[PDB]
Each structure stands twice: as structure tokens, then as C-alpha cells.
Ligand binder design. Structure first.
Ligand code: H3M
Lengths: 285, 266
């Protein structure tokens, strides 16, 4: 129908320019696959969208899959990192929403690793009508310990991290990569290292400060979207009591998938498992 | 139609007036370029795609009769460029993709301003006066191994093609080797060993950079010299200190700088 043509015609204009459209190139957005079922893959700290490469083939035959880099990723032009604007997660949220709008996507499923899990939680709250479902990996509503809440991190602790990062970043990253991967998977470690080196140390520091800062405990109940909470065995940055908290307290229908593998980056270190986990979590919505 | 763009997972990344095309080789897909891509995308527009035979393309699109030789792969390459309205670019080709781009620029001389060939050979079989690196009997044995039990073969093959001890490269390759349907791997493997471009090398006009690694199972040092001597365009050879047939997987800290220098002006 012609009317269909002209309706898409104006929304390309209504919105040409924006944040969104220009973003497509800035954030290296990629659409792959076929399906009327849309899936967004959102990576976390220290990586870029290449982190999803191993599991990507298992999704593209019957999903259209959207990937983008977080603005803090080393694969993004670092002049684009506005230190004021990206003070807290809300601004990363706006980017996601602007990407999806520019692509003209009214309903999708969202997969988020780590801080991207936070981003997705907030986006779902901002736009309950856009996310049919959430899949959350290595996710935490709050990293800092609190009076009754074990986050896994003390303030004095993160401050030590900060210092090490600022003192020699490349050395810090080399040491960090294995601890974050956790498992003895030398290929995940060398991949995580590489994207970690790509980031500019000041942006890494800004982003980490922004993550450790965040606390979503208060708004978990506002989520209306079904969630799959994916938790690995000995996640260094996510205790099991947290995964446990996150699940009880999300207000949409929530299921937990407890992976047998250890480490915080299963999409890198356990793709043989996570791919199948992901097919199942994304089969209907 | 450029439903081809979708079928082959085509991707465009970066910014710049200079276009670059990255084309991968046997047993991988465009993810093989991920480590060096961020070194190109600031001042290049980069086009990546998957060969019709990659494990990340729907295997139903693989027509055994059509893709009987390399001309069809070339067709796909050119169609991608036409669908994107790219009139000129630099091409970066690994292994079989090195052969492809050679055929391509012969076919459309105006389209490719420069070629960069990695792990490149015009012919893998040995011959009377020609040391290519392989013999027919030995090839037949690989086919048997691949047909007998494909995964177990892939696992043994990965580390030897990677060459060097870089387990991370071993694991990526092995992984994308696993993704290929066995019958498609054989057919493409087959096509590559029956290919001989020695006769058309002199027809290339584009300037070329030949990237040779130190102990490449598939590519004797002398093959690179041969390429150099017979390519019909202005040609230079870059010798990598590193070992192995897949430097974008196993030496990306080195290869990226090589590529930056190879693609800085054209
Ligand atoms: C999970 C996490 C720890 C690291 O320091 O930065 C992070 O985002």
C-alpha cells in the first residue's frame, strides 16, 4: 500500500538528524539475520559487540539481531564520549532508545550483559511497550555492599582499583582480564584483554565509576517485562545472593538460569553453553 | 536484488572517503577481522561480509553447482559493491579471498584501487616448475579425514593452520570451522585446490601489497616471491616476523599496523 510507504517516509524525516540516526554510525550499529522477532545484543564493560560473535550464528537464522557498541567502547570514536552527558546510566539508556527508534523497531527482546543489564532494566521501565522480554547476564542492581546488602565490593576496594587503573592502565588490564574471565579459558582472557586495552583509560575510569555508583534496587519492581536472569557459578563481580535478590525483586515474570560454568563473561568463555541458553530464552515472546 | 546484503551478513563500519573491503578465507567469517577493524574504522569506511560458505550464512543458499569455481564468489563480491553503490575501494583478502579479489580487479579494473593479499597463493598444488606446498595424494587424505569425522578433524587442523602458539587464535578458528557444514567445507576446500591463477596474474593492473608470514603451512616463502614477480601491477612484499597462515587471528597487534600503512593512501 502507498500509505505505508509515506508513513515510513515521514518518520525518516521526523527524526532525521537526532541523536539516534547519527548514532547508527557512531555506535557501529549492525543488523543481522532474518525473523520478525527482534533481538538486541548489548555488551558490557571492557568489551564491544565482537563479544557476541560466538553466539551470534546461533540466533541469526530465525531472529533479526541488532548489535551496537556502548559509547565507552574502544571501537567507538572517543571524542564522542561526553563526560558530562554520560554521568549516569540514564544517558546510555537514551542511546539505546534512540538507536531502536531510528531503526523503527516497536518491539524487541533485549539481551544485556552486566552494566547493559542495568541499562536494559531502566529502558524497560522507561518504555514498557518496547521490550517484550529481558535476558540479563552477569547482572546486579548494585555492586557496592550495603547495610543489609552484599554487593561484593567495598568502597575502599574500588578506590584501590581506580588507583591501579590510573597508575598504569595496560598493566592493570592484563592483570584484570583473567580474574574477570574467572575460568581457565585462555581465549576468553585474551579477547577480553584486547578490547580492554582498546579503551582510553579515562573513559574506563569514568564508566567504572558510573557503574559502581549505580543502585537500581529501588526500581526493580517497576519492570513489567518478563526476565530471564542468567547467573554463572562463581561470578567474581556478582555474588549468588545478588542474582537471588535481583530475581525476587523484578516485578515482571522472572526465571533464573544458573549456568554450570564459572566466570563473569560466559558469552566469551562459555559460548557453547550460552548459545543454547539464549535460543531457549528467545524462542517465544 | 541486494537481499544479498542480508544473505551474506554485509556490514559497513567507520567513516571516511576511502572505502576498504575486508574479505575472509576458508573456515572463518568476518569475525576474523574484529581485532584489527578498530584500527581502520576511524579514517576508513569498511565493508565486511561472509563468503557464501561461512558457517554464519544460511547453508540453503549454498548452490554446489553455481559455486563450482571462484567466478561465482567474485559475482557475489561485485554485486555487494554494486548494491552499496561503491565505485572504488581497496580490497583486503585472506587466502581464497586473495584469489577472489585478483579475479575481481581483472574483471572490474576501475573498482579496486589497491589490493592487499594475506596468506596468498595463485596455486596450492605443487607442479613441475612450481613449488606450491601441496600434493594430490595428501589432499585426498585430508578429504577422507574431513568426511570421516569432521569435528575431530577440525580440532586437529586448527592449531596447525594457526601455526603459532596463540591458543586464542586456535579457539576462534576452530569455532568457525565447526560452524561449517562438512559437505560445504569439502566442496570449498576442493574448489581452492583445483584453482590456478598463475595464468592471469600478469593481467592485474592494481598496485598490490603482498603480506607474507614466516612459516605458513599453506604458503611457501617462494610463493610470495612468485606472486611478487608475476602480478602485473606495482607490487611490494611485506614480511611479517610472525609465524602462521592467519595473522589477523594470531598477530593482530602486528597486522593492524601493516594494514594501516597499506591502506593510508590510494
Ligand atoms: C563489573 C565491573 C567491575 C569492573 O571494575 O568494572 C565493572 O563494570
Amino acid at each position: 500500500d502507498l500509505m505505508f510507504t509515506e508513513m515510513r517516509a515521514e518518520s525518516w524525516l521526523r527524526g532525521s538528524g537526532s541523536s539516534g540516526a547519527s548514532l547508527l554510525q557512531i555506535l557501529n550499529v549492525r543488523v543481522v539475520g532474518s525473523g520478525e522477532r527482534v533481538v538486541v545484543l548489548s555488551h558490557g564493560f571492557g568489551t564491544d559487540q565482537s563479544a557476541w560473535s560466538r553466539v551470534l550464528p546461533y540466533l541469526t537464522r530465525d531472529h533479526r539481531v541488532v548489535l551496537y557498541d556502548l559509547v565507552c567502547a574502544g571501537s567507538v570514536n572517543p571524542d564522542h564520549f561526553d563526560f558530562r552527558r554520560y554521568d549516569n546510566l540514564d544517558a546510555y539508556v537514551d542511546d539505546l532508545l534512540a538507536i531502536l527508534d531510528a531503526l523503527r523497531i516497536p518491539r524487541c527482546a533485549f539481551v544485556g550483559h552486566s552494566v547493559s543489564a542495568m541499562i536494559g532494566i531502566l529502558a524497560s521501565i522507561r518504555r514498557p511497550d518496547l521490550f517484550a522480554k529481558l535476558v540479563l547476564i552477569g547482572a546486579s542492581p548494585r555492586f557496592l555492599n550495603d547495610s543489609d546488602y552484599h554487593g561484593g565490593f567495598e568502597l575502599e576496594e574500588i578506590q584501590q582499583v581506580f588507583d591501579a587503573m590510573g597508575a598504569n592502565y595496560s598493566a592493570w588490564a592484563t592483570g584484570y582480564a583473567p580474574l574477570a574471565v574467572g575460568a581457565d579459558v585462555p581465549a576468553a582472557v585474551q579477547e577480553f584483554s584486547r578490547t580492554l586495552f582498546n579503551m582510553r583509560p579515562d573513559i574506563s575510569l569514568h564508566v567504572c565509576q558510573t557503574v559502581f555508583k549505580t543502585d537500581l534496587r529501588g526500581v526493580l519492581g517497576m519492570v513489567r517485562a518478563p526476565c530471564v536472569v542468567v547467573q554463572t557459578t562463581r561470578d567474581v563481580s556478582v555474588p549468588a545472593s545478588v542474582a537471588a535478590y535481583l530475581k525476587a525483586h523484578l516485578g515482571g515474570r522472572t526465571t533464573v538460569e544458573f549456568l554450570q560454568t564459572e566466570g563473569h563473561l560466559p558469552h566469551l568463555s562459555a559460548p557453547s553453553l550460552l548459545a543454547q541458553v539464549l535460543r531457549r530464552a528467545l524462542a517465544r515472546y
